[PDB]
């Protein structure tokens, strides 16, 4: 009874960062060593836990929040950070516990002519709360005038696509990011290592 990490990491499609996909993992054995020692990740950064002791600590739930962002923005997926992703798409709490895993998927996601199927939020009335998932497409009102469903001056579509191309430099290449949030509640603690 192993945890379905294959369904997260080997997925055909990944969600846009503005609408990240939260998969709940429970009642299983999480063989974290498979991921840690895979050496297929460019980023594997753990907060609150040691990356080689992940097997020993049990959790109530493990949440795999999966999304696609560009390289330069990978550094924003961290507690205490600010920026377009950290504030308007996916924000981690200052006391976040878990591991942030990311890898370069340029040869999988980039398309000739640009892959524009991945979007992020640019405009929001306020910053997100930790783990808040805002997927509204309502036109952003930058001014004092209602947009009434019409784009124009001070009326913007809140989302924009990433131009992922095979000729992009690394900072503009797509990365697949999975954040494994470790939650410990008043609970039996069902997810543990082998």
């Amino acid at each position: 009874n192993l945890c379905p990490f294959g369904e997260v990491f080997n997925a055909t499609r990944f969600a846009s960062v503005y609408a990240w996909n939260r998969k709940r993992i429970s009642n299983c054995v999480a063989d974290y060593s498979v991921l840690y020692n895979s050496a297929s990740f460019s980023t594997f950064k753990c907060y609150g836990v040691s990356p080689t002791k992940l097997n020993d600590l049990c959790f109530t739930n493990v949440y795999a929040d999966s999304f696609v962002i560009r390289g330069d923005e990978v550094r924003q997926i961290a507690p205490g950070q600010t920026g377009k992703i950290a504030d308007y798409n996916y924000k981690l709490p200052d006391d976040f516990t878990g591991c942030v895993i990311a890898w370069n998927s340029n040869n999988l996601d980039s398309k000739v002519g640009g892959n524009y199927n991945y979007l992020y939020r640019l405009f929001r009335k306020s910053n997100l709360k930790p783990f808040e998932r805002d997927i509204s497409t309502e036109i952003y009102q930058a001014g004092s005038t209602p947009c009434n469903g019409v784009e124009g001056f001070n009326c913007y579509f809140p989302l924009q696509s990433y131009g992922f191309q095979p000729t992009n430099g690394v900072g503009y290449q797509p990365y697949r990011v999975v954040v494994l949030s470790f939650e410990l509640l008043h609970a039996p603690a069902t997810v543990c290592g082998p």
Partner: antibody
Amino acid sequence: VQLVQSGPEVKKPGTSVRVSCKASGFTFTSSAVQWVRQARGQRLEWVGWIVVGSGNTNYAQKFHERVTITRDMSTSTAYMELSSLRSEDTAVYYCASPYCSGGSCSDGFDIWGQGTMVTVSS
Amino acid sequence: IVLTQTPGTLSLSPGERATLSCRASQSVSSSYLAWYQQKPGQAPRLLIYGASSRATGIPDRFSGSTDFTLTISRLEPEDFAVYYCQQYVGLTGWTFGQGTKVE
């Protein structure tokens, strides 16, 4: 709160001109920039505009085919390039934006650049 | 769209009041119409936006209102400039009127 425009340019017919405006004192990345041009003694003509955050552009039909507007966050600068210059293009080009602070922007173009003359000549 | 700005030239001495007219070729949202003042040799500044709201720094000598006008309750020597109307309706097709020169 100012929008500082680049200097004057002299170009040959058929070539391109690059003009730019650097914003300071306000949240450039939340604003939008429009470009207009004025021949001496004439009315203002609209050229096009860009939303700084989005990178989305729209152009006047008269120039559309040969005009491109871009921007770069790292220098808080908006750029415009007009290709295939014609002698009749000689004009002073201006840029403008609304004032933005935090999540709120003004409801009109309060911030204007100084204007740059672009001359197309032999 | 075509914005018709009249008169070509408005001749009126200081101390008096004036009205400038910008006539749209169709109904337009008042929220997207604005007036600018260009003192010759300088970039224009915003006076009125949203058809009726004063821009920051604009004195009570001016006020706003298819027929849009600029209301000048009183003219002082620095209020003699070329006034333009602008339409921001939609994403494209923004235009200016010819401009009224007030002397």
